[PDB]
């Protein structure tokens, strides 16, 4: 039954929490068999279909038990393949709806602290990746995305994406990316309302010792600007002269890819039909050496057409002041 199966699983769940050994090897094995028959009901056994009647009766018997909050609260205690199940089962429910409205969204809107338990999971290396799979499934829904982007726990990423484990650092950046992108009309509303602090911490990223972090952030800056929804932020960015001071230097970077990535932010400053004074102060003072640079800058890239067009253009701009 879908009714008893959650009751049979909640007991073995509570049991494992705050314990042992002999009754831990027996108990933690029980949660596993539970989580598989759990996932079995949500993915249609071998009778072809998930029934949608048995799946409906199961779905409700879950927010009522409230075990989901604690299941996340003690993910570290589950086994590898069970942790894999937990996400797999969770990812089903988050998606499922009658058609009109997703009930999982409305349920998590209630039990709120369940979301930030996941963002906290980035500090447990044994749980970090799992948590990623959940949150990026959670960010997909607008009302859940509203909660995290505008949270205080949001500015934790800036050292999560610096975490010593490259895998985890990467996985965090993937969420980080997906938040500031997914709902562009939601994401845009956040950035001008928080410019100073957000870009204060972001500026540190572009100065990173870590090659990937540096690259990916510079690339992510590019996309964020070249966006119809983020127009009010880009203009506010492409005018502060500190921002242009940096990009220019990143063009001198040891790395080809980094430079090229920088160039795409660089061009946006120099294409501005409403340049403000400090930008021109910098561009005019360096006029001579700049035409000198763009002439020589990645000429190997011969078949790039659009890039060379952009280049010949940037020189007319700099030449004509």
């Amino acid at each position: 039954s879908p009714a008893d199966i959650v009751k049979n699983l909640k007991e073995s769940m509570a049991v494992l929490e705050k314990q042992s050994d002999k009754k831990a090897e027996k108990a933690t094995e029980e949660v596993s068999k539970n989580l598989v028959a759990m996932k079995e009901i949500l993915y249609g056994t071998n009778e072809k279909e998930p029934q949608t009647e048995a799946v409906a009766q199961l779905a409700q018997e879950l927010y009522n038990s409230g075990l989901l909050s604690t299941l996340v609260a003690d993910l570290q205690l589950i086994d590898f393949e069970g942790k894999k199940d937990v996400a797999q089962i969770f990812n089903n429910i988050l998606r499922r709806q009658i058609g009109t409205r997703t009930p999982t969204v409305e349920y998590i809107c209630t039990q709120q602290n369940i979301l930030f338990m996941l963002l906290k999971g980035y500090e447990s290396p044994e749980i970090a990746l799992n948590c990623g799979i959940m949150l990026r499934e959670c960010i997909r829904h607008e009302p859940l995305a509203k909660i995290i982007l505008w949270s205080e726990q949001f500015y934790d990423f800036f050292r999560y994406v610096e975490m010593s484990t490259f895998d985890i650092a990467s996985d965090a950046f993937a969420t980080f990316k997906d938040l500031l992108t997914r709902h562009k009309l939601l994401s845009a509303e956040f950035l001008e309302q928080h410019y100073d602090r957000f870009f204060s911490e972001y500026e540190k990223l572009l100065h990173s010792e870590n090659y990937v972090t540096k690259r990916q952030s510079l690339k992510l800056l590019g996309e964020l600007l070249l966006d119809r929804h983020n127009f009010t932020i880009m203009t506010k960015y492409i005018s502060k002269p500190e921002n242009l001071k940096l990009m220019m230097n990143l063009l001198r970077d040891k790395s080809r890819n980094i430079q090229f990535e920088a160039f795409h932010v660089f061009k946006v400053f120099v294409a501005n039909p409403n340049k403000t004074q400090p930008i021109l102060d910098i561009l005019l003072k360096n006029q001579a050496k700049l035409i000198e640079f763009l002439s020589k800058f990645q000429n190997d890239r011969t078949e790039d057409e659009q890039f060379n067009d952009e280049k010949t253009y940037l020189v007319k701009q700099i030449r004509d002041l």
Binding site: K245, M248, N249, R252, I282, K285, N286, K289
Partner: peptide, 5 residues
């Protein structure tokens, strides 16, 4: 080398 200062 760029000149800012």
């Amino acid at each position: 080398e760029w000149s800012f200062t």
